[PDB]
Nucleic acid binder design. Structure first.
Ligand SMILES: C/C=C\C=C\[C@@H]1O[C@](O)([C@H](CC)C(=O)NC/C=C/C=C(\C)[C@@H](OC)[C@@H](C)[C@@H]2O[C@H](/C=C/C=C/C=C(\C)C(=O)c3c(O)cc[nH]c3=O)[C@H](O)[C@@H]2O)[C@H](O)[C@H](O)C1(C)C
Ligand SMILES: Nc1nc2c(ncn2[C@@H]2O[C@H](COP(=O)(O)OP(=O)(O)O)[C@@H](O)[C@H]2O)c(=O)[nH]1
Lengths: 83, 99, 208, 385
RNA sequence: UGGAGAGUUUGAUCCUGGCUCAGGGUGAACGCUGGCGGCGUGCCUAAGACAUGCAAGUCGUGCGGGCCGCGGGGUUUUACUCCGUGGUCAGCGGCGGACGGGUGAGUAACGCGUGGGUGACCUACCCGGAAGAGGGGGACAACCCGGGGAAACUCGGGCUAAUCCCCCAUGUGGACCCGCCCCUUGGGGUGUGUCCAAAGGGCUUUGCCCGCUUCCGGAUGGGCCCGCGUCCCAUCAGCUAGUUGGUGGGGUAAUGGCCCACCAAGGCGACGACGGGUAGCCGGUCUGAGAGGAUGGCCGGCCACAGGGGCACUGAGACACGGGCCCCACUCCUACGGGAGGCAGCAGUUAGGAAUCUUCCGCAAUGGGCGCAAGCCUGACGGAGCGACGCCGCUUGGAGGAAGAAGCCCUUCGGGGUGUAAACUCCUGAACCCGGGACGAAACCCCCGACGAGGGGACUGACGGUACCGGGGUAAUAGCGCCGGCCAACUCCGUGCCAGCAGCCGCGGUAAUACGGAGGGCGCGAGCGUUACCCGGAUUCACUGGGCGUAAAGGG
RNA sequence: CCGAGGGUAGGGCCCGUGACUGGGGCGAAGUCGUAACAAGGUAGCUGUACCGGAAGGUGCGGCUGGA
RNA sequence: AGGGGCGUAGUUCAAUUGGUAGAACACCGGUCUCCAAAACCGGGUGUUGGGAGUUCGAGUCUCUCCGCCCCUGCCA
């Protein structure tokens, strides 16, 4: 199906994923349906996790299974909070 | 020395036989249906073609024909038969057809 | 690696006195003060009108030799100095002054250039807090260069730090002589750097 | 499907000798079948092996015969004790002589004997004569021929009586038995040397192979220290320059070894090396140990005619061959002035220039031959180049 | 925001013109030399052949068994072992093995690029909606026994379970023929007739969770079709029978000659058909002032292939890299009647070659398959290794130190040079040593709250005792090319059209800045040269930007 | 029915090779002459044709890039 | 690794009754000249592949050794 996974960019010992929506079948670093965010797991910078709520939510509303860890970050970004 | 994908093969042969039969049926049962449709058996014709139209949608249930494939086989049947029975016939006992 | 070898051998040859040794090269014997001629066996005979090429070569070598920067970096830094918006003349000269060790030398600390490098390669030098050891480190605005503490008591750092009392630093650097700091207020200017180099040529030499 | 090798018993390797045909090769077969009963469970030198319920043995069976000398030498240059085989038919044979003076030319301590083809023409004086002939010959080459274990016992007999059945213990065969007589005459009398393991590492190369799906293997007779999987090494000697490699294989008689020590004939699979890069003669040593050289002064003693060597001596400019560890490289001879007159049995020192780089280290003996006859032996002194 | 020219035809000059050099570039190789680190990157040739190990599985919360360790005797003991229950072998059944990973052989073509079309279609799993899930029957494995067999495994008789199969009902709806209406290529609504559904599994149990069936829609991924673009030879000029179109069929998810009968004679070509050669295309990459030229390796997208070749089966999807059937060639086993394999998956071997790496560690992260879950698998991937193959950073010290040691080289024998270079003085501390030592890892999961929101809790690091930090701390590698002009750099000796050099012009025939050595110098430095190939210079195929009276060029 | 492959037969394209043979380029100091360059000692060049060891000669016509 | 070959001036080749090794053409050396070619005088210019052996004497006859060609060898 259409997932919301993390694609690895950046150099060696310097990872930098890009939160993205892709068909669960594509290579993890291959072409993707739409980027909606990035995440530096080592922080090394105030901004190490931004996401695009409006889009993240939309995909979730049409069937886009997030990853165990991908979901954690949408969460931390504040996508499922409803008030 | 091997790997267990063989489960998929044996299995393959099995159901490759299941719809092989379901299929050869629809066929031998479609022919006879029309093989009368030109004779004029009307009533009996629509009888078989009615069993025919069953066996087709039937196979459509599993991985044998599925959708439109079945729908085509039907349309041609409920076509040839009809197109034949009009060569001096009139549809006796309301078979699958609807005039 | 950074030459290492007979330098007041280039004060000569380039015929434009050089003080890559500092103290001595500043004395009544810069080597230059006894032989205003190139080395070799000949070195003192008529000279063919140096070719349009030669001039540029000498101009470049004049400069590059004047830092110790080995070509590779020299010429490399040059290219960066090109794309950067502006006159390559200023820029480049400026990007040559941004060289950590250089500034070190530019702000007392070390008698000469070759010496300022080692100070860097041993830690003795420090920037905006944390220390640094890459002679190539490029200084940016508002950053002060401070000596380390383990050194401050070293026989060398003394005498060298002393020569500041009285003498003033370049018009783009400060200096807490007692607190060995001094910032890099801003990239130096063509005029501020009174160098025996005709940048415009050194530039033409890389066209061909 | 491979199976490791595990240590228990000490280890001493040996080989057979004696005039061609007599009795080796076929006998060698036997000794294997025998110590195969009650253990374990169940033209070109042939390494094989077998173990008495007392010690581990590595067996080298040089095909013998003339023409095959250079190859022969490298065999008795690595064995601790030779099994001088003799047939109870012909007696002290010529090659039995040559496979002897050699042994004394390579040191080879102690030589067990064995009268083969015994089950043939009995004779009072004979069997008691043959054993007399031999000893009368071993002392003819300064060996302990008088106190030498002379077992009798035509071995083929042992073989064919073990071929009917792969299981038979001692005493049960008036023909096997005659084997164990040697397997106790060897167990005893034949010492167990001391190989320095505290020393660096070295291993002359005997043969080189290429095990399919692996690469090049080099078999040799450990000199000093040791070598286990994953140790870097320099292939010093012969070729352009000393290449380097990482040992990634060590096996004892086709059985995985854990750290073959000195005196162990193991096969070492080297990492990334082609069969053309590894020749015989050259050496495997500890990286930094030993260096290839061609000019050296050596303290040499030229054998006397009566002692085998030359009988006309020579002058400066003579080019004999030199034997180190495992090969034969040629060399030009240059004398330290006035030494021009170098006659037999003389003892002096000059300088040699080999036409091929070789692992020399000062403190290493060698051997000068020429025209089919060890002309003299010496040792490396100072190294010029 | 961007354009440099030189040598060489002549006694000399101007022009024309070719050759050559100075600049970048590379999956490079070869020579001399080689210290550290990071990040990249590494069979361009035989799409040659390959030992060995691993590259795909998972669910008992779908079902019945085998066997073992244990509730513990079923009756009262080893009778009907019913079952409690965590496991372990295979079978049944489901989902995944069609993705990921490899290669460039084939292919000049809707293959790719780009823009569109589908009233001519499909899409497992994933979302939103609607309606359901009632009765019934049956088989084959596994297992028991018998048989042939070297083996791989097979035949026969008979039990048995299901979410395996089939029959009837139900008909929200859907499919089909005919009619009507809307719409316009097969779409949408509608009426009469006919035809079609479905399975139970675990719990904490009139409720949930995971499933199941039918239709509609959403997503994503696809098929097919169309316009334009896409190399060299015209010494290749004509090509075409399923050929071009029609009608009715078969076929398919679907269009279509895709295939078939019958009919008609068509279709295509200098706007280059047919044929021959070479080649996977692109984003891009190198070069260029630009227009262009060259190229398509790494990474990303599409295509194609899986020893050579043909075919289908299962299925949402394959005519299927580690599935199947068959032929072939090759290699191997064999109890000679039949069996076995396909590294262009990762490591590795051999061959070929100027040349291209470890049978490594880890699933810790990311990503994937299956599972309610715990979790299992994963040579995808994250790392590590090797090679100056490349880029970048760093080192071999710094400051003093003589009208200037020695040695070597020149000399108008006064001296000049190598040279502040050394020695020598202080000074720092690459390496190494001791101590400390990461980020990358927070959720799956658990507890409060409803298994929602939100808050808290616990496990987990291959790289590594590495980076990094603190303290201690030794003066500690240098080479390669060139020095006639182009082109930075000159003397002595040797040789004597010899030996040799040479990119172009040319150097050598007894005083050679050109050969070879030395001193000295210039350039660049863990590098420096050499060879091959691309662009530039070459306005030297000229669109930008050239020419033809006599230099090549006006057709009789 | 079709069909991989195999088999007989005959065409097309291209590549390698062949006794012998044709001319071509190149190669310090070979042989014969003397065609051309100065009416180059017969103005040269030229298309064609015949002839001659060789350059070349002569015929016919043409050119001036000859007087 | 083991057999069997093959190695003579600068090249192609002759002496194998065991006897300093020549034959041709080259090249070398002078003279003339700048220096060659030509011409004229004058010359074997060889590591008999190396090194030893036997022998009064070795290209020849032994052995060993270098390079090359051919054949057979060669899974820890
Ligand atoms: C000999 C070949 C290779 C040697 C290689 C090396 O040798 C060595 O370097 C070795 C080190 C000492 C070495 O140099 N060997 C090299 C030399 C070593 C020589 C040593 C010891 C001597 O002593 C003076 C020793 C033999 C001595 O001789 C005597 C014998 C005399 C015989 C005369 C001949 C007689 C009657 C006879 O009939 C006869 C014959 O035999 C042959 C032919 N025709 C004949 O008619 C006696 O037996 C003594 O014992 C090491 O061993 C290395 O490790 C090695 C093995 C690699
Ligand atoms: N009867 C008998 N024959 C033997 C004996 N030893 C050897 N042979 C035979 O004689 C020959 C021995 O030659 P081989 O074994 O090759 O010994 P090598 O030639 O010395 O290695 C072969 O035919 C053996 O079978 C023995 O002890 N008894």
């Amino acid at each position: 199906m259409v997932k919301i996974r993390l694609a690895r960019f950046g150099s060696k010992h310097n990872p930098h994923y890009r939160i993205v929506v892709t068909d669960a079948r594509r290579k993890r670093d291959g072409k993707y349906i739409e980027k909606i965010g990035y995440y530096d797991p080592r922080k090394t910078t105030p901004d190490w996790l931004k996401v695009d709520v409006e889009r993240a939510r939309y995909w979730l509303s049409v069937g886009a299974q997030p990853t165990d860890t991908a979901r954690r970050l949408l969460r931390q970004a504040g996508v499922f909070r409803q008030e | 020395r091997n790997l267990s994908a063989l489960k998929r093969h044996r299995q393959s042969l099995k159901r490759r036989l299941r719809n092989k039969a379901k299929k050869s049926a629809i066929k031998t049962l479609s022919k006879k249906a029309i093989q009368l449709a030109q004779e004029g058996k009307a009533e009996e014709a629509l009888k078989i073609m009615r069993k025919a139209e069953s066996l087709i949608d039937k196979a459509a249930k599993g991985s044998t024909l599925h959708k439109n494939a079945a729908a085509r086989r039907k349309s041609r049947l409920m076509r040839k038969v009809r197109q034949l029975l009009e060569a001096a016939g009139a549809p006796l006992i309301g078979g699958g057809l609807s005039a | 690696g950074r030459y290492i070898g007979p330098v007041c051998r280039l004060c000569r040859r380039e015929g434009v006195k050089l003080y890559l040794k500092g103290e001595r090269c500043y004395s009544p014997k810069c080597a230059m003060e006894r032989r205003p001629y190139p080395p070799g066996q000949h070195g003192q005979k008529r000279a063919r009108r140096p070719s349009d090429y030669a001039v540029r070569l000498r101009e470049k070598q004049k400069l590059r030799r004047i830092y110790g920067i080995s070509e590779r970096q020299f010429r490399n830094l040059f290219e960066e100095a090109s794309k950067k918006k502006g006159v390559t003349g200023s820029v480049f000269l400026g990007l040559l002054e941004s060289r950590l060790d250089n500034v070190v030398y530019r702000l007392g600390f070390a008698v000469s250039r070759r010496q300022a490098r080692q100070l860097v390669r041993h830690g003795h030098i420090t920037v905006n807090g944390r220390r640094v050891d890459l002679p190539s480190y490029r200084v940016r605005p508002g950053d002060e260069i401070a000596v380390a503490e383990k050194s401050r008591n070293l026989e060398l750092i003394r005498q060298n730090l002393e020569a500041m009392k009285g003498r003033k630093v370049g018009p783009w650097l400060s200096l807490d002589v007692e607190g060995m700091k001094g910032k890099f207020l801003r990239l130096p200017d063509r005029e501020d750097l009174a160098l025996p180099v005709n940048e415009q040529l050194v530039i033409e030499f890389y066209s061909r | 499907a491979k199976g490791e090798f595990v240590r228990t018993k000490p280890h001493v390797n040996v080989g057979t000798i004696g005039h061609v045909d007599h009795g080796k090769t076929t006998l060698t077969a036997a000794l294997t079948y025998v110590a195969a009963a009650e253990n374990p469970n169940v033209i070109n030198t042939a390494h094989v092996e077998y173990e008495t319920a007392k010690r581990h043995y590595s067996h080298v069976d040089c095909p013998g015969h003339a023409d095959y000398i250079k190859n022969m030498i490298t065999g008795a240059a690595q064995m601790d004790g030779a099994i001088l085989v003799v047939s109870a038919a012909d007696g002290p044979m010529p090659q039995t002589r040559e496979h002897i003076l050699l042994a004394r030319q390579v040191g080879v301590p102690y030589i067990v004997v064995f009268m083969n083809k015994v089950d043939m023409v009995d004779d009072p004086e004979l069997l008691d004569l043959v054993e007399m002939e031999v000893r009368d010959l071993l002392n003819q080459y300064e060996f302990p021929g008088d106190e030498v274990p002379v077992i009798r016992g035509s071995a083929l007999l042992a073989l064919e009586q073990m071929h009917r059945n792969p299981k038979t213990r001692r005493g049960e065969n008036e023909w096997v038995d005659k084997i164990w007589e040697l397997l106790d005459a060897i167990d005893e009398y034949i010492p167990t040397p001391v190989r320095d393991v505290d020393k660096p590492f070295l291993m002359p190369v005997e043969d080189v192979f290429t095990i399919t799906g692996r690469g090049t293997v080099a078999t040799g007779r450990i000199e000093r220290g040791k070598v286990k999987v994953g140790d870097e090494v320099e292939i010093v000697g012969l070729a352009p320059e000393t290449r380097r490699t990482v040992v990634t294989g060590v096996e004892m008689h086709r059985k995985t070894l854990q750290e073959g020590i000195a005196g162990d004939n193991v096969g070492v699979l080297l990492r990334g090396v082609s069969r053309e890069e590894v020749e015989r003669g050259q050496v495997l040593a500890k990286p930094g140990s030993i260096t290839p050289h061609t000019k050296f002064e050596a303290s040499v003693y030229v054998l006397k005619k009566e002692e085998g060597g030359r009988h006309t001596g020579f002058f400066s400019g003579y080019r004999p061959q030199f034997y180190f560890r495992t090969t034969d490289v040629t060399g030009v001879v240059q004398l330290p002035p006035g030494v021009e007159m170098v006659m037999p049995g003389d003892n002096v020192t000059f300088t040699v220039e080999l036409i091929k780089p070789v692992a020399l280290e000062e403190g290493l003996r060698f051997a000068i031959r020429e025209g089919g006859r060890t002309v003299g032996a010496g040792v490396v002194t100072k190294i010029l180049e």
